[PDB]
Amino acid sequence: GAMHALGHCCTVVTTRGPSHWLLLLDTHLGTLPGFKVSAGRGLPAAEVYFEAGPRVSLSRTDATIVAVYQSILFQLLGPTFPASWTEIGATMPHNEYTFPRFISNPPQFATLAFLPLLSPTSPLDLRALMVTAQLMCDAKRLSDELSASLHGRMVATPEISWSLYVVLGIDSTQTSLSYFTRANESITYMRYYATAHNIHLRAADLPLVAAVRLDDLKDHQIPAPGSDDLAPKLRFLPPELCLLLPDEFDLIRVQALQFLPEIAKHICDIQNTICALDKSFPDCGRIGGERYFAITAGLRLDQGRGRGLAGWRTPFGPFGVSHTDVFQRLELLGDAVLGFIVTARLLCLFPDASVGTLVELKMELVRNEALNYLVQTLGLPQLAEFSNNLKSKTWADMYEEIVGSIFTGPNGIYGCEEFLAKTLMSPEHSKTACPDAVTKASKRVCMGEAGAHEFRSLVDYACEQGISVFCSSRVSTMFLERLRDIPAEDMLDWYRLGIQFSHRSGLSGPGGVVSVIDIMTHLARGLWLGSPGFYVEQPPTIPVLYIYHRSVQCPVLYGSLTTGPVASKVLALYEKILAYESSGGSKHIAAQTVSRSLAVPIPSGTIPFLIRLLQIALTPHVYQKLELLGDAFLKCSLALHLHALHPTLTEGALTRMRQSAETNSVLGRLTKRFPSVVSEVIIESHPKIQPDSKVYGDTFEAILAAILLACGEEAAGAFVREHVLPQVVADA
Numbered sequence: 001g002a003m004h005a006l007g008h009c010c011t012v013v014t015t016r017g018p019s020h021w022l023l024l025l026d027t028h029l030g031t032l033p034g035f036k037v038s039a040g041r042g043l044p045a046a047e048v049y050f051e052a053g054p055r056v057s058l059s060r061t062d063a064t065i066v067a068v069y070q071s072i073l074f075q076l077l078g079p080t081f082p083a084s085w086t087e088i089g090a091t092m093p094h095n096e097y098t099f100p101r102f103i104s105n106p107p108q109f110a111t112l113a114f115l116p117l118l119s120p121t122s123p124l125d126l127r128a129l130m131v132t133a134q135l136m137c138d139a140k141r142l143s144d145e146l147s148a149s150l151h152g153r154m155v156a157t158p159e160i161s162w163s164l165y166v167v168l169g170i171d172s173t174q175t176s177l178s179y180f181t182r183a184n185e186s187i188t189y190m191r192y193y194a195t196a197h198n199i200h201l202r203a204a205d206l207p208l209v210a211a212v213r214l215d216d217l218k219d220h221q222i223p224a225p226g227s228d229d230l231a232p233k234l235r236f237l238p239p240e241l242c243l244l245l246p247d248e249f250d251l252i253r254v255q256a257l258q259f260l261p262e263i264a265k266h267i268c269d270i271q272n273t274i275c276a277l278d279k280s281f282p283d284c285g286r287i288g289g290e291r292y293f294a295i296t297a298g299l300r301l302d303q304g305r306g307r308g309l310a311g312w313r314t315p316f317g318p319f320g321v322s323h324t325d326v327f328q329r330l331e332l333l334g335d336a337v338l339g340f341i342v343t344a345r346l347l348c349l350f351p352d353a354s355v356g357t358l359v360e361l362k363m364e365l366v367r368n369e370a371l372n373y374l375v376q377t378l379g380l381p382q383l384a385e386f387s388n389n390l391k392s393k394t395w396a397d398m399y400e401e402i403v404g405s406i407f408t409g410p411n412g413i414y415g416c417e418e419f420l421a422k423t424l425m426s427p428e429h430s431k432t433a434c435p436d437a438v439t440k441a442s443k444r445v446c447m448g449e450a451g452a453h454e455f456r457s458l459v460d461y462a463c464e465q466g467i468s469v470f471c472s473s474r475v476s477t478m479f480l481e482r483l484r485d486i487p488a489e490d491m492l493d494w495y496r497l498g499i500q501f502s503h504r505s506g507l508s509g510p511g512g513v514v515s516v517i518d519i520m521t522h523l524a525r526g527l528w529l530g531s532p533g534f535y536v537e538q539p540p541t542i543p544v545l546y547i548y549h550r551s552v553q554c555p556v557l558y559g560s561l562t563t564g565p566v567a568s569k570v571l572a573l574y575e576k577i578l579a580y581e582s583s584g585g586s587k588h589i590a591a592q593t594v595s596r597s598l599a600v601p602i603p604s605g606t607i608p609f610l611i612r613l614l615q616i617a618l619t620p621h622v623y624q625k626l627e628l629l630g631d632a633f634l635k636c637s638l639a640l641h642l643h644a645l646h647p648t649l650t651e652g653a654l655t656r657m658r659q660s661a662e663t664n665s666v667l668g669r670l671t672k673r674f675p676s677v678v679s680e681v682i683i684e685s686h687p688k689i690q691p692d693s694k695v696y697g698d699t700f701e702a703i704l705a706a707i708l709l710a711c712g713e714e715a716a717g718a719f720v721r722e723h724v725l726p727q728v729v730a731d732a
Ligand SMILES: [Mn+2]
Pocket: 103
């Protein structure tokens, strides 16, 4: 293009070596997922690796010198390919796309050009191109112009479809006047070319060229001066037909060039997939190539059929990871964080619930049965394609894998929170005329004119009409009683927070629907996202605020500490837990010694709160819920750390791995490595207990939660990598 041109260091790799090219796109496609092409239509199997580079600028004059090189390439490609890279992709048979069923005609198509590179680092040379165009211009026939200096050189027959051949030497045994036979018939080459092609050979008296067609020499090695290793495919052709290609166009280039059409198809495929499925597949915030590979990993559940996933090419992620392997490890991780977020939020949504029922409720929301239904309402089954010769996989797994994708993508844990809040609660989860006095309240709620009793009326109504806004009948029922326990002066703020979130999520306008179902839903999402803390049973309220430690904030929903309608509640609880009169005996000392033994940098002035929780973690009947949360986080943090440390490992390995460092005996050991003052306090609280007890293990889990709650997600995850990760036992 003009200046609008982005570089990529495209590399085609065959059995015989690597070939380097500079791809130029006029479109931001981020990084392009490499792919590998199957054993070919006259070409060998190969692998194509990309990597983004400079943002190269081109003057009009230079851009047209590129255009020249292009046409040199198109000519070598032969008359079978339209002389435009766009037209090559934009006429692919549908069965060559990654999604033949969703071929969506993009408004734009990309505009690409290819240029040679001597190495993946050498700069773009424009003067070089012009020389190559000059040498091609000058390049003469074999008649004008030894059979050891021609060995391995590229030659094309421009009078006959511009086919490409590799010269093995000159066979003086025969001449265009010589004969060759096809069973029952013997003709002279000179007569053949006249009979078939309407070519009347001039220099007929010259010795034929012993060459082999590029189509035929699939991956085979070229022979020496001719000791001729594989000769049932050898061909002899008149020297006046062979146009000798310049030294730049060696065997390596010319073959790699046969794959450039696939790279054009790939970029084309990427673009289609995006503007066909980008709006129907939960948003991870990726763009271009990576968004493609995400949708591919996410919906192409099986592997290709012989030839490949998309046509003859099968895309792979970083470190040569199968798109299936990706889905496999993103499901594992996604499953692990869904557990974390659901734990942390249920913990606050039902502050009074026991660890017993929190666990029960989680499994009601994460259960296959439920996720399976959630995936149906997303309409993924319709888009997912597989050959059912792929057994143990479930619809429900798509949900987990998505959460994984969203998490590991640019949107972060914020994306996951958003995706869960859109999907676990939704008006689509109940059934439905309604009384008079109820429509009046609903109307008043929507235009902000609503107050205390209007909500009461609406709750009490839904509370008896059995309205379920969660994808669980138990959770929905339990949500309704949590609502009765919430001060009606508060409900207007929760609702606003819910509708606010619904708006930014793109699933509503600023106004609600004016139904008790929609109102019931918004109340839910508010309270899901924003409930401030949970109670530790018999002792104040522990505030959940690890979100405000996030290095990227979201004032629209959560606000800031210095103070909204939610932030204020959280802050309130925070100030009350500090002011708690510290009866600091030996526990308070253990808290302090733990406070400094974290071997990990914590945020500033966060200590006094950490001590308070570390105390709770170290008291006997109270750690229960902190343990629950710590357990949850540890799985998810460890899953992450391993996911990163082992880019090529799949479901089985990564599971067996983190399970080995998550066991109660293992965590217990780590608790004993703290100053003996800590072990002392544990044995002091629990009379006559033994080194193999469950309690050491669980207090570690409890401590991890204390760190998470008081210092935030990155401090807690640091503490995991520094202390828990080194205990993971290799599968070898
Ligand atoms: Mn079409």
